[PDB]
Symmetry: C3
Subunit: 132 residues, 3 copies
């Protein structure tokens, strides 16, 4: 699997907690607050992890410094109102366990009722570590 069962953080490392992160607008022609504005689950997943990368780089860190990831999905039309786990994985495997970014955080992923942003199908929460 593209995740670590456990991730150990040394006591000498500082933790960085990251607020829930929602996708960026993908289609400025689409009606406001619609899934079309942000993409299907795969496209929104790509957007959220791009954004998380930018957040971390602002702290001189990157996606490989993430030690824990929590993924909240809402149901998608492609999967009949169930979470689109395949689309999540298709986006996710582009950012973790890759040649460019080989590290894999601990992860939890599940389906919730709704996210505060209309049109959003995914929100991602993270904890990162900065070594001594």
């Amino acid at each position: 699997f593209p995740i670590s069962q456990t991730v150990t953080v040394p006591a000498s490392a500082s933790l960085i907690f990251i607020s829930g992160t929602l996708p960026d607008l993908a289609d400025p022609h689409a009606p406001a607050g619609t899934p079309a504005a942000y993409g299907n689950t795969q496209v929104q997943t790509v957007s959220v992890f791009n954004k998380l990368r930018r957040i971390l780089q602002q702290q001189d860190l990157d996606l490989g410094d993430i030690v824990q990831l929590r993924v909240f999905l809402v149901g998608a039309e492609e999967t009949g109102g169930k979470l689109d786990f395949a689309g999540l994985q298709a986006g996710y495997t582009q950012f973790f366990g890759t040649p460019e970014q080989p590290l894999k955080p601990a992860r939890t992923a599940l389906q919730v009722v709704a996210l505060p942003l209309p049109g959003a199908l995914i929100e991602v929460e993270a904890v990162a570590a900065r070594s001594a």
Copy 2:
């Protein structure tokens, strides 16, 4: 926004993990286990953060020591079964980013199906830090 995108915790600080916190009874005349016993989303939000303050003060800490907040909402009648995000924010902005309590933790907020306590519309989980 009244939240921090990221919060960094020094490695020399101790972490305090706080169990999921549910509102206190607001109306002792209301029928048991009803939303009326606890209030609408705003009132329950105020109650939960009052309670979190008391929990922290028992540890000689306060709401400004919170580094991460996770808010689980259930749907409300005022908002047609969607989470009442406006009411959450109306309660939340009374405890964080205020003159009395200027610090803003990292936060995630989302809608779940149900909370273990009947009548509860919000449950809040937190991590706090105690500096060296």
Copy 3:
């Protein structure tokens, strides 16, 4: 209650983040992906905490080193589509606050829409600490 309101972790301790943990197959005769394959909420809860114990023991730790637990439940037929909180507690009290394992982590428990594994009624996320 069988949980700690707060758990404090010294800054000298290392943290271990554990990915979301789902139950093991309980009945190899049952049809794939059904709740019968894994058990009711109580049986699945027992399975998940057995598995978490094994994960920790692989790191030379055990369930008493858990400082925070997050429990995501899906609705059960025994409880009319609400989370089966009684079954969770019946399984949970066998692993925490017992003579064999007296320590009680901070905990949050709530009902979500769906888990990525068909048939699963519970997924558990954890953080553990290794003292200096």
